[PDB]
Write a protein that binds this ligand. Structure first.
Ligand code: HEM
Ligand code: TW5
Ligand code: CL
Length: 443
């Protein structure tokens, strides 16, 4: 019957842009509390956004089919990045074919050699950059570098990596990313505003696709199982091969999706583990990794690091890098006693749901041993048909980096407290200038 309650608006043009922009964790909890409803509506620039902040109603967000709750419309800003006809921009069944092919390239079947590849690259990094017996580094920056270097080592064959190294790939991604206006998800008119300098997303994407095209021509001529090689075997149900434009787009989705999420997750994990109050947890991590061989394998990381995975999960739980998952409502959906109407953006919020007192009591405490107290309350990687396809790969990366770094080094935060989350970037992570850390090589 009933519309969800709307948080009062004092300035119509902006709606709640000020309070939601400045501090989304505070503002979302305050609406939930003061309006006395887990499901509620805010305005971003006049656009209604209805938030399903009751974890007992998570499935009313994650379960409806695409023609009812549609991701396409929220993600049209990505069209220049992934490409026209790619991913969200494809008809829904074709989108699903595409994402499923990419998912297959990121399953456990592909991981046999990943751990040595990740480990070797991480050691290379520490050997080049953490040389002395002790030194000061920015941990957020170094994790970033390690994430992209390790992902390329895993996913791209040597011929590719010779035309497109990690630094070159990073720069191309950065140009595609710096073009985006995150808020245009709600206010597409922002696209009309002038830029400080010309965007370079079209250029960067075309340069990538051109390089892949050349790699393929050269491979056709010599004769296979890197990410690219895999995607080139994909054949849709209609009998057509995934095109070079589509393959490029999937590869971009892969690298783009993991570069900040995984970096941030790595960084938070280390930041907690190195803080003095969490000595008991770092001691546990050492119990679990200390009998590992110098050359880790699949079994060590997949099967024998459950504590470290808990540490990683709890870091995403407390400070999820994606605060909101969103859909356009194409037809009304019932959620509890409310009805959410056509034209709303509906959202399920990992930031909010992960701070629900019932599901996660004392939510600002980092407790790797906690379990959700409401089934499905943890939505850091989403849920249902659209759940994260990179999650097993990302965990494999993060856990391998933790096992490798803390084996050879001790770390200490320069400041007194784990960093504040910086809510000012679309992928939210620890405040960059609060992330200075002193490493000390173990004797
Ligand atoms: C810790 C790291 C990561 C986090 C926290 C994260 C989070 C999420 C979330 C919350 C979703 C659901 C989005 C939605 O329902 O609309 C998701 C979907 C997705 N993620 Fe990730 N992700 C991570 C790493 C990765 C990586 C490494 C990839 C690499 C390919 C990736 C690719 C995707 C894809 C393709 C989907 C879309 C699935 C779909 O719409 O069906 N993610 N991720
Ligand atoms: O990080 C974001 N998006 C990118 C887009 C993207 C890359 N690869 C993908 C694969 C599948 C789906 C999406 C993507 C992204 O990296 N997403 C992502 C990463 C890992 N797994 C899944 C997704 C992102 C994150 C937040 C955001 N917002 C939320 C906040 N917002 C907002 C907040 C406050 C105010 Cl006042 C105004 C606007 C505008 C839109 C928009 C975004 F595009
Ligand atoms: Cl395009």
């Amino acid at each position: 019957p009933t519309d969800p309650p709307v948080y009062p608006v004092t300035v119509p043009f902006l709606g709640h842009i000020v309070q939601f922009g400045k501090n989304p964790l505070e503002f979302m909890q305050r609406c939930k509390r003061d309006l006395k409803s887990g499901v509620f509506t805010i305005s971003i620039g006049g656009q209604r956004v209805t938030i399903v902040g009751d974890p007992h109603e998570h499935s009313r967000f994650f379960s409806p089919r695409n023609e009812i709750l549609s991701p396409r419309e929220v993600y049209t800003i990505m069209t220049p990045v992934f490409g026209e006809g790619v991913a969200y921009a494809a008809p829904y069944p074709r989108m699903r074919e595409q994402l499923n092919f990419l998912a297959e390239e990121l399953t456990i079947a592909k991981f046999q050699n990943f751990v040595p590849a990740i480990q070797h690259e991480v050691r290379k990094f520490m050997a080049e950059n953490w040389k002395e017996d002790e030194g000061v580094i920015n941990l957020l920056e170094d994790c970033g570098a390690m994430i992209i270097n390790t992902a390329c080592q895993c996913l791209f064959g040597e011929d590719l990596r010779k035309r497109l190294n990690a630094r070159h790939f990073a720069q191309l991604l950065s140009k595609m990313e710096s073009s985006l206006i995150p808020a245009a998800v709600f206010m597409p008119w922002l696209l009309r505003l002038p830029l400080p300098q010309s965007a370079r997303c079209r250029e960067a994407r075309a340069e990538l696709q051109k390089i892949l095209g050349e790699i393929i021509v050269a491979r056709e001529k010599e004769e296979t199982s890197d990410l690219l090689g895999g995607l080139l075997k994909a054949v849709y149900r209609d009998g057509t091969r995934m095109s070079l434009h589509e393959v490029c787009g999937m590869i971009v989705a892969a690298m783009f999706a993991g570069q900040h999420t995984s970096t941030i997750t790595t960084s938070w994990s280390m930041l907690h583990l190195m803080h003095p109050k969490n000595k008991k947890w770092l001691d546990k991590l050492h119990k679990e990794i200390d009998e590992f061989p110098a050359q880790l394998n699949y079994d060590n990381v997949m099967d024998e690091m459950p504590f470290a995975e808990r540490c990683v999960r709890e870091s995403i739980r407390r400070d999820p890098p994606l605060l909101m998952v969103m859909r356009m409502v194409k037809a009304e959906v019932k959620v509890g006693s409310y009805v959410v109407p056509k034209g709303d953006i509906i959202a399920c919020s990992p930031l909010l749901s992960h701070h629900d007192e019932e599901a996660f009591p004392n939510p600002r405490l980092w407790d790797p041993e906690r379990d959700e107290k409401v089934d499905g309350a943890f939505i850091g990687f989403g849920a249902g048909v659209h759940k994260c396809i990179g999650q097993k790969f990302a965990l494999l990366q993060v856990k391998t980096i933790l096992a490798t770094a803390f084996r050879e080094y001790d770390f200490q935060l320069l400041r007194d407290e784990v960093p504040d989350p910086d809510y000012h970037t679309m992928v939210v992570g620890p405040t960059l200038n609060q992330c200075l850390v002193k490493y000390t090589r173990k004797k």
